[PDB]
Structure formats: C-alpha cells, structure tokens
Design a protein around this nucleic acid. Structure first.
Ligand SMILES: Nc1ccn([C@H]2C[C@H](O)[C@@H](COP(=O)(O)OP(=O)(O)OP(=O)(O)O)O2)c(=O)n1
Ligand SMILES: [Ca+2]
Ligand SMILES: [Ca+2]
Ligand SMILES: [Ca+2]
Ligand SMILES: [Ca+2]
Ligand SMILES: [Ca+2]
Ligand SMILES: [Ca+2]
Length: 901
DNA sequence: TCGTGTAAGCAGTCCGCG
DNA sequence: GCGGACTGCTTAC
C-alpha cells in the first residue's frame, strides 16, 4: 500500500512524523528536514521557479529550519519579500507525499475518552488539578475496546468494584442499562490508588498512542486535567509522556473577553467532538452538555441519577462508572450518525495538513493552493499584514409583508464558488480595472460594456480569460466532490419519501428490511418489494435511509462550507491571498446577478400573463428569488385540478419547461455583458409552496427580510409524502425561543398555512388557557452570556445591563456562599425566566446554566414566582401578533353581527 | 466564544418626545 | 407608548 502520514510536528530543526508505512505498520521518524524558500531574481538568471505573477525566483536551500526562519526575519529587516511555504511541516508533507493521499482509516488509532473527578468544593479546575482522577474510560478504535480505569480508594471515599453484571441489567432491574452491544467490549481495571491508576494509564497510552484524540470537552477539560494532575503528582517529565515525542506546551486561547489554557500534545491530533459538532453540525443548541446533544441526536433518555455529581461516586459508584462508560459510547454513537471524524480525515488528507487544521479554512486553503502551485514549480507569495476593513456583501430584497398563496422559489447553485469560476477570480488573474457605473446601470443593462478583452465584475475588476486561476481550479475540484455527495443525500431523501408512502399501507407479515444502497434512487423492483413489506421492516428501512441522508448531508454541506469559506477567506486579513478587490468582486457580482434575474423573471412573466410592470418576484436573498405563482394557477383555474399533487405537478413542469429556460437565457446574456470566462449561473427551481387544495390555508407569509414561512410540497425534486413547513428566521427557528413556545408557534404557523384563520384561533385560545402547566425548562428563554463581570457592580446590575445578565446576577446573589451550587460560566448559555413583582430574589428575572435543572436551593421559589403572564406575552403573543398582522388575519375572533342571536 | 465572510432581524436599555 | 442610538444576541445567506 501507499504510505500516509498520521501526524507531523516541527521540534527545533527536526520534523517528527508518525506514519503508516508501505506494509501498513505504524512508524515514527525524526527527519532533519532542510526547507527551501525563495527570493525574486534577475530576469537574465535561468530558473524553473516563478511566482504566481510569472516573475522569476531563486530557490534558497537552508541548512536547517531555524536558519530559514532567521532568513525570513532578515528579509523583513531589509524590506524584501520572502516567498514560499513558511510553515515547514506543510512543505515537508508536500515533499514526502507528492501524490493524492489514499488513507486507510482502519490503521488510524482514534481514541475516545472521558474522565471523572470527584470535587466537593465546586468545579474541578483543570489548571489546578487538585482532586483525584477517579475514573477514566478510553475507547480505542483499533482494538474496538473500552478500557475502564476505576479508582477504588480515594480521600473522598473507598468503594467496591464495578459490576458488569449489574451494569448490563435494565434500569428497572436496578441496573445501568449499559448497551448490550458494548458489554463484551469492556476491559475493566480497578485500582487500589490513584498513582497506580495513572502510571498504568500512561503505560497503556504508550502502547496504544492516539493519533486522533476525541471525546466531549477533552481539549478544554479532560486533557488539561490529566496532564496537570500527572504533573502535580509525578512532575513535568511524566506528564509529557502524553506526547509521543515528549513535547507539550500550554497554549493560551484568546477571545474578545478573556483567555483560557489548553495543552498542546505534540504528535497527537486533538479533535474535540464538541468543537467538531459546533463546526460541522449546522445547529445552534440551547445547551452543549453531552446529555442534551445525545438526546437531540440519538433520542436516548437523560442519564439519570440521584443527588449531585460530587456525591455520586460515594453513594452509587456502580452507576458512576457505568455512566462514565456510557458517556464515551454516546460520542461514538453521535459519530456513527454524523461522521465528523470521517469528514475531518477526508478534508485533512486532501489538503495535506495536520488533521486538527480542518478547523481552519484559511490553513486548509493555504495548503491546497500551495500544493497545487508547487506542482507547476510556482512559488507562493509571502503573507502580509493588513488592517481590518469592512466590505459590502449580498443584496436582500425588502418584501411587502403579506400572505402569499402560491410560491415557487429558485436558487443559484453554489453561488460564490460559481462566481469565482465564471469570472475567473484569483490573485494571479487580475488584469486591471474599468470605470464603474452605479450598480443599477448594470442591473438594467444600460451601462457601457466593461471590457471587450477581460472577464469582469461590476465592482470594477477585470480578469484574464486565457487560463484558469489557481483559486478557480482548486475550488472546482472541491465543488465537484460536494456535488457528488449532495446527489447521494437527495437520493436518500427521495428514497425516504417512498418508504413513508409505503408505510400508509404496511403488510401483515414477518419479513426483513431490503439490503439496498440508499444513496441511489430505488429501482422499480425495490419499489415493488417495499409495497409488500411489514411496518417493522419499513421503519428499519426508513431509519437507514435517514441515516444515509445524514451522512450525505455531512459530506456535502461541509464541502459547501469549505468552498464558501474560500470566498470569505479572501476577505480575512490573515489569509495569504487576502484581497478586498477579489472579495468585493464576488459579492458585488452576486448583487448584480440577483437583481438582474429579478428583472428578467418579472419581464418574462409579465409577457406570459400579458401585463405590464407587475412584480412577480416578491422576495430574494443573496442568490434566491421567490416568485408569486397565483396568476399561473389562476390561468388554468383551481377547479381543473384533481388534487394538491396535480397543481404541484403543473407548477413543477412550468418551472422546468418555461421558467428555467428563460432564466438560463437571462444569465447567458449577463455572462456576455460581463464578458465572463464561462457561464456558470445555474438557477434551478427550489420550492413549490401553497395551501392544500380546497382548504382555507394561506400557503405562506413574509413579515420582513429573512423572516418567512412556506407550506412546501416539493423541495429540489423531493416530493413529500406530507407537506413540510419551510420556516426561516421566525422565532420557531431561534435557539433563544423557549422549547414549548417554538412548538406552539410552529403549530400556529402550520394552521395558518394549511387550515386557515379559524383553525389558528382555536389553537391560540387553547394554548393561552393551558400554557401555565408547561414545565419551567420548556418555557424558559435561552441566551449566551458574555461580559458578566462588566455589568456586575457589587452583585447588582450596572448601567445598560442586559436582561439575561441581570438574571445571572440575581441567581448569583441567591446562591451566594454555597460552594457546591452550579456556577454560570462566562460565554456559555443560560435559561432565563421573568419573576413577578415582589419576589424574594429582589429582581425581575433569574437565569441559570442551560441544559440543567435549577438547583434545589431555589427551584421551589423560582417556580412559585415565575411570571407566566410576561413569559406568554414576550415569547408567544408578541411574535404571533407579528405573524398574523403580516398575514392579515386575527388570532382572536373579532365581534360580528351574528353574536346577537 | 480559536478556527472564512456580510446582511439584518428582534429584545432590551436609556431616554427623548412638549 | 414608540422610536432612535446603542449593545447583545441570533439568524439567513
Ligand atoms: N454560511 C454561508 C452561507 C452562504 N454564504 C454565501 C455563499 C453562497 O454561495 C451564497 C448563497 O448561499 P446558499 O445557502 O444558497 O448556498 P450555495 O449557493 O453556496 O449552495 P447551494 O448549491 O446549496 O445553493 O451565500 C456564505 O458566505 N456563507
Ligand atoms: Ca461525567
Ligand atoms: Ca444557492
Ligand atoms: Ca438547487
Ligand atoms: Ca403494503
Ligand atoms: Ca439560497
Ligand atoms: Ca425598539
């Protein structure tokens, strides 16, 4: 097999590399890598190296990496560009793996771990590590085993061995319900003392050294705690055994309001799963506790125990250990679903970066572009300092707030990357500038043609057309990968709807789910077999189809994120190819494209309808248009349709056969006008929306920019078994909105769109009447909490104190003195509840850590003093009044003349 | 919230608005 | 009360 790296580090003048050799064995080597860098040279000097602008360069080979680094400094001192890859380990990887890396995940040691630390005096700070580590569960992907290290003797209590037999039993048998499928995979090791536990853990770590290290909050808690605890007990040298090269450093992570420390373990790639989740999941969660996320992702119940976690070991060590094991497994289960580790390996090896660098689109693209240019013996420019400057982005049309009955939407495929490719936008393809007219003049095609030679953006920039720039070439490669995976995702989605339809008529039989590839549209044969399957088999197939869809979603949306990240990186001062001319060339072209096609679509539909100046495009944002289809439906007449699916079919055909060709004609003209390299503005139908045929539903409504709701029957070729609400921006979509209020607002919207005014009024009256019964957590608001200290004046709110911060200050006074009480953590999320006038907390609201029950110290009083009236008005009535006033309907029945009977 | 970008919505504070 | 200037937070793209 072809070799591939696992990890790479620079340590002084050495590259330390862990890799899989040609025989599939893990090896480590130290290489005295001599880096090369470049300087511009005279044109008369014969060379094969050229910078991206075609200027000749001389290669400078250094005796060692420190010499190269010193030379860069002196070049700055002199005032001359020092060209080439200054991150020498990226250059090392490029030299050592000069081919497309094919990796074998089965050879990569992925470790998932979690620790427990009993602490009587509050949160055990990892930088202090003053409390014993009393449990470690460490899962190893190569062994496929859970290694459990259990401390039986501690200053906080001596306990008996954990019982695998009790662990396996149902919670209803007094067990812990450790999943049967991992029972045989547990290797349990009890310890008489913590020193023995940690010494054995390090020996184990040396034998089975993680390449990828993950878990939940491992970078911020588990790793620093273990490192510092071992340091405290044994000294620095022993703690450094966590690194295969015995090198670690404290890294200070800075943000806007403070800093925290992590431990860099040289020769390990730490991919904390909470951070993978935040980057790759495209969710914004009210809480990021593992309990909360596992419930959300896997629909598993809360890991239930009595009393505080600080007393759990002494009271129920059995459960303590089982829950530690289950915590490790839950991360594996989330990864089995989301496949973020797989994604990270894919992206990291593709770019030829340290795997942990996948968190950085700038580092990722720097490597991709460097490797690409190096293939042509081209030399990358030096990174420069730039002041942060604001620049313009997308256009968003102001919609007229209203109900909109029939709506068809259209959207440009991968807009910003498509613009980059169409226009040929790259650092080295800049050809010059032209004199810009106001954007309106290009939109309406009255401005002079920018260039008869070069490819243009309406920001004034011109680009070469003779050859593709490196940015277009590389972005195209990732776009093509993205497209493949999006294909699999949509197939799995369509396949899911086939199964949902079949579930209306399940067969009374005993059978098995079909062995199929859900990434491909079901054949006629498969569809026929599905129609004969039992509910049990169908439901298993639906689960599998949905899991396939999720895997496709992970693969495609994050490749989309990477390519859109390149467009954004052009506007980040730390990117090697930072250039606001290029960043604005993209965004300004986007503004033109949207408004150009709005005009073309309006012109086309006015022609087909025989009207003048009527606005068919009701809304657009960045690269999408929403088209009112009322007049198209009305031209055949609602009475002529057999059912909802009939008019959906009709609009689908109208969009594909009439509107899309008109749109493509419109964009081809725009391409010619801007003299672009290649026509890549591909705008296809997205949504078909409307009320159910014969209903009083309103179909859709807009309240403002980025705030709308649609009842969708077909989305990108997926014909739903049941209509799906597409709600954007409204409170149903916001993590700050209480959970039960999201639910209620969604049902209000469903009724508005599908059933009409009377249905909405019936539901509102009931919710208003019953909502006080809802669990307090379900009706609490949520907010991130920054700058708590700034607004804290002797425990009380200072000037301009935000509402949620005031709630935290109230909480802090109420728990003052109690060392065990859960503390609000700066930068994390809180639940927030309003308090009634005259409450014992002395203020109008209280806040506590999100994803948790409020401490029993104050729970009863919070419940007693909760202001239900304010809660309802603020979170429910106010947003609903917004929806209904926009939609021109009433959530309460108005008086009429009939009331007199 | 260490980690690519801008546009733009709503909650809430402070305080004007005769 | 509502609305502007401002901060804070959270979406859509
Ligand atoms: N997180 C995001 C989302 C969007 N955009 C920009 C780049 C996109 O190209 C454009 C339009 O956003 P879309 O959500 O419609 O995404 P794309 O057009 O890129 O992809 P798709 O093919 O799925 O429509 O907005 C961005 O910079 N960052
Ligand atoms: Ca725990
Ligand atoms: Ca798009
Ligand atoms: Ca599309
Ligand atoms: Ca059937
Ligand atoms: Ca879009
Ligand atoms: Ca206001």
């Amino acid at each position: 097999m072809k070799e591939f790296y696992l990890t790479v580090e620079q340590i002084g003048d050495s590259i330390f590399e862990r890799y899989i050799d040609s025989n599939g064995r893990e090896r480590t080597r130290e290489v005295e890598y001599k880096p090369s860098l470049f300087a511009h040279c005279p044109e008369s000097q014969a060379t094969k190296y050229f910078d991206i602008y075609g200027k000749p360069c001389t290669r400078k080979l250094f005796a060692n990496m420190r010499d190269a680094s010193q030379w860069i400094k002196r070049m700055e001192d002199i005032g001359l560009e020092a060209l080439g890859m200054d991150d020498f380990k990226l250059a090392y990887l490029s030299d050592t793996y000069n081919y497309e890396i094919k990796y074998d995940h089965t050879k990569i040691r992925v470790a998932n771990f979690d620790i427990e630390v009993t602490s009587p005096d509050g949160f055990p700070e990892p930088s202090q590590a003053k409390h014993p580590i009393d449990a470690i569960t460490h899962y190893d992907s190569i062994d496929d085993r859970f290694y459990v290290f259990d401390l039986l003797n501690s200053p906080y209590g001596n306990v008996e061995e954990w019982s695998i037999e009790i662990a396996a039993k149902l919670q209803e048998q007094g067990g812990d319900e450790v999943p049967s499928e991992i029972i045989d995979k547990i290797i349990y090791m009890p310890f008489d003392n913590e020193k023995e536990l940690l010494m054995e853990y390090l020996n184990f770590w040396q034998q089975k050294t993680p390449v990828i290290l993950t878990g939940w909050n491992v970078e911020s808690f588990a790793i620093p705690y273990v490192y510092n605890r071992i340091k405290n007990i044994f000294g620095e040298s022993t703690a450094k055994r966590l690194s295969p090269h015995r090198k670690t450093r404290v890294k200070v992570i800075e943000n806007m309001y403070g800093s925290r420390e992590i431990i860099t373990l040289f020769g390990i790639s730490v991919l904390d799963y909470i951070d993978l989740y935040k980057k790759f999941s495209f969710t914004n969660q009210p809480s990021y506790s593992l309990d909360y996320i596992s419930e959300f992702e896997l629909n598993v119940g809360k890991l239930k125990y009595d009393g505080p976690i600080s007393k759990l070991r002494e009271s129920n060590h059995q459960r303590y250990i089982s829950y530690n094991i289950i915590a490790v497994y839950r991360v594996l289960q989330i990864d089995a679903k989301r496949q973020f580790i797989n994604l990270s390996l894919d992206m990291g090896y593709y770019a030829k970066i340290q795997i942990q660098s996948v968190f950085s689109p700038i580092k990722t693209w720097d490597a991709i572009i460097f490797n690409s240019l190096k293939e042509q013996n081209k030399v990358i420019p030096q990174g420069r300092s730039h002041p942060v400057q604001p620049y313009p982005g997308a256009f968003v049309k102001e919609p007229i707030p209203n109900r909109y009955k029939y709506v068809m939407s259209f959207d440009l495929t991968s807009l910003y990357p498509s613009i980059i490719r169409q226009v040929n936008i790259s650092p080295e393809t800049i050809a010059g500038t032209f004199k810009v007219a106001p954007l309106h003049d290009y939109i309406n095609a009255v401005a002079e043609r920018p260039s008869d030679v070069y490819s243009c953006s309406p920001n004034g920039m011109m680009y070469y057309k003779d050859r593709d720039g490196v940015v277009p070439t590389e972005i195209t490669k990732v776009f093509n990968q993205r497209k493949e995976h999006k294909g699999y995702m949509l197939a799995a989605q369509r396949n899911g709807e086939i199964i949902k339809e079949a579930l209306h008529n399940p067969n009374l039989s005993v059978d098995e789910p079909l062995d199929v590839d859900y990434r491909f549209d079901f054949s006629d044969e498969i569809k026929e077999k599905i129609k004969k399957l039992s509910a049990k088999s169908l439901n298993e197939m639906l689960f599998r189809a949905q899991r396939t869809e999720v895997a496709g979603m992970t693969a495609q949306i994050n490749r989309k994120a990477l390519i859109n990240g390149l467009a954004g990186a052009l506007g980040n001062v730390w990117f090697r190819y930072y250039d606001l001319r290029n960043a604005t060339a993209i965004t300004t072209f986007g503004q033109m494209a949207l408004q150009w096609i709005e005009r073309k679509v309006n012109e086309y539909l006015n022609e087909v309808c025989g009207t003048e100046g009527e606005a068919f495009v009701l809304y657009g944002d960045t690269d999408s248009i929403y088209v009112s289809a009322d007049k198209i439906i009305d031209k055949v007449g609602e009475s002529k349709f057999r059912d909802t699916n009939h008019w959906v079919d009709f609009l689908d055909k109208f969009a594909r056969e009439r509107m899309e060709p008109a749109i493509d004609r419109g964009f081809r003209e725009m391409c010619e006008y801007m003299n672009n390299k290649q026509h890549l503005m591909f705008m296809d139908r997205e949504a078909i929306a409307g009320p159910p045929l014969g209903s009083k539903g309103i179909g859709g409504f807009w309240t403002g920019k980025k705030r709308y709701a649609l009842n969708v029957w077909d989305m990108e070729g997926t014909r739903y078994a049941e209509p799906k609400l597409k709600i954007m921006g409204l409170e149903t979509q916001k993590s700050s909105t209480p959970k039960a209020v999201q639910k209620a607002l969604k049902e209000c919207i469903r009724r508005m769109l599908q059933e009409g005014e009377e249905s909405l009024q019936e539901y509102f009256k009931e919710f208003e009447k019953e909502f006080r019964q809802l669990n307090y957590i379900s009706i609490a608001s949520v907010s991130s909490a920054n700058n708590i200290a700034k607004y804290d004046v002797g425990g009380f709110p200072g000037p301009k104190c935000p509402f949620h911060i005031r709630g935290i200050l109230t909480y802090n006074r109420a728990i003052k003195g109690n060392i065990d009480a859960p503390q609000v953590v700066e930068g994390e999320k809180v639940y927030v509840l309003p308090l009634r006038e005259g409450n014992p907390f002395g203020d109008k609201c209280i806040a506590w850590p999100s994803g948790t029950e409020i401490t029993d110290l104050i729970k009863d009083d919070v419940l007693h003093w909760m202001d239900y009236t304010v809660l309802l008005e603020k979170t429910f009535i106010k947003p609903l009044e917004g929806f209904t006033s926009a939609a021109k309907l009433d959530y309460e029945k108005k008086a009429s003349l009939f009331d007199m009977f």
